[PDB]
Design a protein around this ligand. Structure first.
Ligand SMILES: Nc1ncnc2c1ncn2[C@@H]1O[C@H](COP(=O)(O)OP(=O)(O)O)[C@@H](O)[C@H]1O
Ligand SMILES: Nc1ncnc2c1ncn2[C@@H]1O[C@H](COP(=O)(O)OP(=O)(O)O)[C@@H](O)[C@H]1O
Ligand SMILES: [Mg+2]
Ligand SMILES: [Mg+2]
Lengths: 371, 475, 371
């Protein structure tokens, strides 16, 4: 048989068979319900649109994300997402396919317990396993050491690994992510004259963020340039017209990552959390962690983020170290590639949580050595 | 090297009708990696013959074999066979065959293009781990020959496009990965050319007679033994061991048939599992081949780690894996297996690098978009249940196992017969013999295994009348 | 055949075939264990890193010296050290090679008995012998009289020898050695603001001690000079940057040898113990003992130790006695050179302890007159 790798992620569900070079199905993790009445008789609208289908009917639905920051908050929506992924996207029966799942660090144990219970009971998967996003990202990056910064749409965290050994006491988790950037972009667009409130327009604001935003190497210099020059202004076409032009708002939204004080967060920027995590580790491995800084996740895809973070870390770090940042073009799908590599390994076949073990030891078997 | 196989068809009335030819288990590692004292295929040396000047100048081939990187690593030339008139004979045979000379010229130019794949060079970039080419003249000439664009080919090699969900994204490649991809493409195109040539020969040979029951003829390389055994020899040994196990099973079936015919039936234990114990430590999961295939996927694997894993997973736990032996100052030994032919030791060094066969999808698409015949060779290459292995997840060993399995799904359907040929001496002089040579031939041919299996039962069978006319005088 | 000369010592295992000019394999004697869990699967980490390999993985290992003060306290670790030395550093099977061993004077008999038992049972060497670490150093100096001061990392001792006749009643042993100096440097570096606690960075502190520490000719004068001026300060580059500067602490660390009261020990200084051992012997050999002082061991490699020790002993000794101290450049490896010279002697071939003799007489053969 063959193994199945499913990555719930946050804001995007991506899945595919193990041993593949890229996920087959990638679609937003959205469950929408019709908010109007409906007057035509005979068509028989369904009561729930799930997945990429909800994007097409975005204008007549209330889009709800089943997960806020890694933690699943609406379980029924998650059974709907998983059922859609397993049946209408891959068209496979999970009765004969082991499933590998990806899960962020420092999350409630009840989350993993319920995930495994749902997988074993509702879908009757023969075996399953839960892994950490950072380890998979390091797998796909062709590395065995180095500190990896995984910044998705749900949560941003750093996990330092040296020689295949993790440093649990040095793991730092920050809840600032892409969703907060989108919300700040909404909050900062209204000062120009454009108001976005409905959950349907969340997608439009996110698309504007993806298509136009970029990280500035220097903040004060760029603001001074934009205060006088107008070469930073670009137009965007809304799905109905009335093009909008944004000036300094394009490079101010991603600055929240390095300046979390913009949205009221007390913590420090990602460039500072990475340095703090490096200094948390032992003194004999700091050089290798400095020389093998790994990036992953969708939020790290902004143009010029690598140069800005390298400059910041070089400013923080001693002047006698070479700071190198690895930013492969496929940052977004790095975790799934690592999952495919991990599931395709032959020695991994004895680390699955089989059905017999789950039945014998209950849902608590997840937190054993089969972490 | 390749496992030639000819099927001879017959008519309905038991008369000769037609012949069908197939090829199996052609080795690709010989194209890129050669032993220090061994040559490559005769193709490249034959092309470098100086008696045909037109091909060299029209292909812009360097007349010095030393310059080319793919060829100079092995032994440059030996007095095996004078290549000139052999090349002219092959050209004449092609000329008198069914197809025209343009196809022959396409063959030579494609081989020349395969030659120029070793001249590709790549270097690191300004402030990135990405790799970019430095020289482009060889790339330009290769693209000119293939009818491609040099810029497009370089962009495809450096930045392979891959499909994710519904959108295309570009992947990054370093120097090692691009070198592996360059080697894999050269091996794959050679394989496709050979298969297409075999299909053309089969079509030309084909007659319009109906094909009733056939008589298969199988030729395969023997159980070669060296003092520097490597992966290529390991595959051949494993194939020969599978064939010997098949022969043992067939002989056991024949012996049981004779026993049930004579009503003398005992010792019903099968004779297969005794040899299959060694097979189960190669092809099965957690076997040597499986561990080797997994190890190359781990991005920091090294030979020491691979040997350590083999020792951890097989030393003492299995009944066939054991420590190597140092005899008469042999250069290197890492582990020793036991086969039907005795104790064989293999060298780990160099196995990991040459096992990888990562193909590039965008280059295959560019070949399909080419203006030459090459698109025919690469016409088809790489949801409701899929197991398509990725381009990166491609190992020579997996292809070898798949080909051997598909061959066994075909050979097992026919009743087999065995023919053994033994060289009497190493010299041309008739009459004289070399006893160690005959010992080695008998050992690799499995005759000792046959007599050993015969000796555990009752091998001597005499009729009652003969026994009476010979042994009744005793009492 | 050839003989193997193994010198376990403490903190540095050095070995090689007899008759060689210098030892072939020199590496620290430490055993490392991974103190983390390991997240990457398929690598197959070994459960114990031994020898020079553990120095490269200091950041994810805990280092335990199997020898505290001359004696062996962890026999499994010592067996691992010996196996590594025989099978990796030298790559020679000990089945057909006699071994020569060294240990400090005045050690428990159980240690020697267990060493002999392990070496005949586990490794099955044809023969073996144990020699005093000081007599071999005396051989390596081309002398036949005089006292020898073997200040290693575990223990410091003095053995007076006159015309090849040892004087057991005048042997003085002191437990102050290089390890205590390293610990004292770790303790006194805290007053400058640098904290070293982990066993991994003890090696770093040892590197500073080797590279920068030196013995002062006068203590009060150097103290006044360091307090007034700042020309004695030097800077050392840590493995992760943040260069540090050590001043007065530069020569305070090696002064513990002449001032044992710094670490709380009641015993007298090195020079006083040497003088007491000199006057513990007879009266007709004191002049030759004065004129042939021999230094050996790693700890005696500080710059200026010879001059200070000569000045102190001259102050103690009568004025009309000539005092000379022999300090060859190869102090650290002198013991192994002497061992190789002794094993190369033809008359020594009959002093080996044959395996048959050990079997007939039991492990107590070594303490017997068949030494
Ligand atoms: N090119 C881009 N530029 C800026 N942001 C992007 C880009 N592509 C994706 N994103 C952001 O990344 C998020 C997707 O992150 P994802 O990798 O799905 O996280 P997870 O793996 O936790 O599901 C989207 O919300 C989007 O805002
Ligand atoms: N030049 C030097 N300066 C300071 N310390 C030294 C020097 N040379 C050696 N040492 C110390 O001596 C110790 C090693 O001594 P060694 O003679 O190898 O002991 P053993 O023989 O018991 O292994 C080390 O811990 C090291 O710190
Ligand atoms: Mg993610
Ligand atoms: Mg010593």
């Amino acid at each position: 048989t063959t193994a199945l790798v499913c990555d719930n992620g946050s804001g995007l569900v991506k899945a595919g068979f193990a041993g593949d070079d890229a996920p087959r199905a990638v679609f937003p993790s959205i469950v929408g319900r019709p908010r109007h009445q409906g007057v035509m008789v005979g068509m028989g609208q369904k009561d729930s649109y799930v997945g990429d289908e909800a994007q097409s009917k975005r204008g007549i639905l209330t889009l709800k994300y089943p997960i806020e920051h890694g933690i699943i908050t609406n379980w029924d929506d998650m059974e709907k997402i998983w059922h859609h992924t397993f049946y209408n996207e891959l068209r496979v029966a999970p009765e004969e396919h082991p499933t590998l799942l990806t899960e962020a660090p420092l999350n409630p144990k009840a989350n993993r317990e319920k995930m495994t219970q749902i997988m074993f009971e509702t879908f009757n998967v023969p075996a399953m396993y839960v892994a950490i996003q950072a380890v998979l990202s390091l797998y796909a990056s062709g590395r065995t050491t180095g500190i990896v910064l995984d910044s998705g749409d749900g949560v941003t965290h750093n996990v330092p690994i040296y020689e295949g050994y993790a440093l649990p006491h040095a793991i730092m988790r920050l809840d600032l992510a892409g969703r907060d950037l989108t919300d700040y972009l909404m909050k900062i667009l209204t000062e120009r004259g454009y108001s976005f409130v409905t959950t349907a327009e969340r997608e439009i604001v996110r698309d504007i963020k993806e298509k136009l935003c970029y990280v500035a190497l220097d903040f004060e210099n760029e603001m001074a340039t934009a205060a006088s020059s107008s070469s930073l202004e670009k137009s965007y076409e809304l799905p109905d017209g009335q093009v909008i032009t944004i000036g300094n708002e394009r490079f101010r939204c991603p600055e929240t990552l390095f300046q979390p004080s913009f949205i009221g967060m007390e913590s420090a920027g990602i460039h500072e959390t990475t340095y703090n995590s490096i200094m948390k580790c032992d003194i004999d491995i700091r050089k290798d962690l400095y020389a093998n800084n790994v990036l992953s996740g969708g939020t790290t895809m902004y143009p010029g983020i690598a140069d800005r973070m390298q400059k910041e870390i070089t400013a923080l770090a001693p002047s006698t170290m070479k700071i190198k940042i690895i930013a492969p073009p496929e940052r977004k799908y790095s975790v799934w590639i690592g999952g495919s590599i991990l599931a395709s390994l032959s020695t991994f076949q004895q680390m699955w949580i089989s059905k017999q073990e789950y039945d014998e030891a209950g849902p608590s078997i997840v937190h054993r050595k089969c972490f | 090297r390749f496992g030639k196989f000819i099927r001879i068809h017959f008519g309905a009335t038991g008369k000769l009708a037609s012949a069908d030819i197939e090829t199996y288990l052609l080795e690709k590692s010989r194209v890129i990696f050669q032993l220090k004292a061994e040559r490559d295929y005769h193709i490249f040396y034959q092309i470098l013959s100086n008696k045909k000047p037109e091909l060299l100048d029209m292909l812009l081939i360097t007349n010095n074999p030393y310059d080319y990187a793919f060829i100079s690593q092995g032994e440059t030339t030996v007095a095996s066979i004078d290549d000139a008139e052999e090349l002219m004979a092959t050209d004449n045979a092609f000329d008198v065959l069914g197809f025209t000379s343009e196809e022959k010229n396409s063959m030579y130019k494609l081989t020349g293009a395969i030659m120029h794949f070793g001249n590709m060079k790549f270097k690191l970039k300004q402030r990135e781990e990405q790799a970019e080419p430095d020289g482009t003249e060889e790339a330009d000439k290769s693209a000119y020959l293939m009818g491609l664009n040099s810029a497009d080919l370089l962009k495809g090699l450096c930045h392979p496009r891959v499909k994710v969900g519904n959108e295309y994204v570009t992947k990054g490649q370093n120097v090692q990965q691009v070198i592996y991809a360059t080697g894999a493409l050269a091996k794959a195109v050679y394989e496709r050319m050979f298969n297409w040539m075999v299909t053309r020969i089969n079509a030309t040979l084909e007659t319009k007679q109906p094909r009733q029951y056939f008589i298969g003829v199988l030729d395969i390389a023997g159980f070669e033994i060296f003092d520097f055994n490597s992966f290529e020899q390991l595959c051949i040994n494993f194939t020969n061991e599978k064939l010997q196990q098949f022969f043992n099973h067939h002989m056991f079936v024949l012996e049981q048939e004779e026993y049930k015919k004579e009503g003398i039936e005992w010792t019903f234990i099968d004779f297969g599992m005794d040899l299959q114990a060694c097979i189960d430590l190669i092809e099965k999961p957690m076997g040597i081949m499986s561990i080797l295939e997994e190890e190359c996927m781990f991005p920091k694997a090294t030979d020491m780690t691979f040997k350590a894993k083999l020792f951890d997973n097989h030393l003492g736990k299995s009944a066939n894996f054991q420590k190597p032996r140092n005899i008469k100052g042999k250069p290197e030994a890492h582990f020793s297996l036991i086969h039907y032919a005795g104790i064989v030791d293999y060298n780990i060094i160099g196995w990991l690098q040459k096992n990888k066969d990562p193909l590039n999808e965008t280059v295959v698409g560019l070949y399909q978009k080419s203006s030459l015949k090459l698109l025919s060779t690469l016409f088809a290459n790489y949801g409701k249940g899929k197991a398509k292995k990725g381009s990166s997840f491609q190992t020579v060993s997996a292809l070898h196992r798949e080909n051997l399995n598909k061959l066994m799904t075909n050979l097992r359907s026919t009743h087999p017969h065995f023919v053994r040929c033994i060289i009497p001496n190493e010299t041309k002089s008739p009459g004289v013999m070399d006893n160690p040579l005959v010992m080695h031939q008998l050992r690799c041919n499995g005759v000792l295994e046959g007599i050993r299996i015969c000796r555990k039962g009752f091998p001597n069978r005499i009729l009652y009348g003969d026994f009476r006319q010979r042994y009744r005088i005793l009492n």
